[PDB]
Write a protein that binds this DNA or RNA. Sequence first.
DNA 1: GCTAAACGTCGTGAGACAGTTACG
DNA 2: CGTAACTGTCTCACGACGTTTAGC
Lengths: 152, 152
Amino acid sequence: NTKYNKEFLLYLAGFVDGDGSIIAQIKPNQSCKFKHQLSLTFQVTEKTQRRWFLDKLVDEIGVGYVRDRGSVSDYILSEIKPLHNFLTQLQPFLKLKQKQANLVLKIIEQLPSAKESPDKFLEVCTWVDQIAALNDSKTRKTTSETVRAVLD
Amino acid sequence: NTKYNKEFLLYLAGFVDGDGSIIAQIKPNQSCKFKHQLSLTFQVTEKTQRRWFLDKLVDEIGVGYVRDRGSVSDYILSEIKPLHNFLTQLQPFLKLKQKQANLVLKIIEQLPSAKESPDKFLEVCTWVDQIAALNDSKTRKTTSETVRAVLD
DNA sequence: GCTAAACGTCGTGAGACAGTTACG
DNA sequence: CGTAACTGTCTCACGACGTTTAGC
Ligand SMILES: [Mg+2]
Ligand SMILES: [Mg+2]
Ligand SMILES: [Mg+2]
């Protein structure tokens, strides 16, 4: 559980507000109690020629990984605990995505309790709804609404 | 000459490296001594539904303006003096566009010189090529080469 | 049964200049 | 005349996703 340099966060908050994305997704999964797993993601996207910058982030944030997908690459961070540690420290420097960041933290803290009450699950699935709402969401298919089909 | 807040500069540098663009252009123009105007531009593009972030920048940088081009907007800054002043302070924090930033300071500084000889001008046009080669240039027409076709 | 590294992609939201003009 | 503003717009470079495989 590491604490990052302040100037590092200021710069990164800016980069994230630029080419980054704080994502929340309701992933349909047929093994989970409620037929869906919650998934959280901090990601930065850059043309593959600039893959080194992303590779560097791995080192600096000290967790996460970089993958390839064509002419573009991504730094990806989904591990729930390191993700909370990171966002908690980045969150106060963000400007275009401060809200989704705090919605993500909020979702993580309310994770265990989301496992019990099927209604507390919905509520948390609401959190993710708000996030896609704030982003420039377009190709979204699985919403908290579809989780309504958790009625049987 | 306005002094900028270092935290503002760190965050902005990150944002610039993301949605920003540092550009130098060789604009053909039949009223200049060498039939080409040297143009410099610092810009940040953002979806129009987010132009408040660009308006904010107009207020914080103190110079520059915002233009609308449909679904997206741009903060633009081309005035030589404020530009050179702004880049000098921002440059030390850029990670991805530092070189083009520095090439711009270098060009702006050689303006008068290049304004007194077809050779300096030529060399300076060569500076513009490097910037272009550093960016993800895809629709560039005029180059130092096209300018050399002035030799006659 | 839930986290999570992989893997695949719709529709832009950007980056990046082209071209022409009004004026200081 | 010379430097910036006004105006255009191509070609993506990312954003905000969906689905499969790994594995304890
Ligand atoms: Mg952006
Ligand atoms: Mg971007
Ligand atoms: Mg970018």
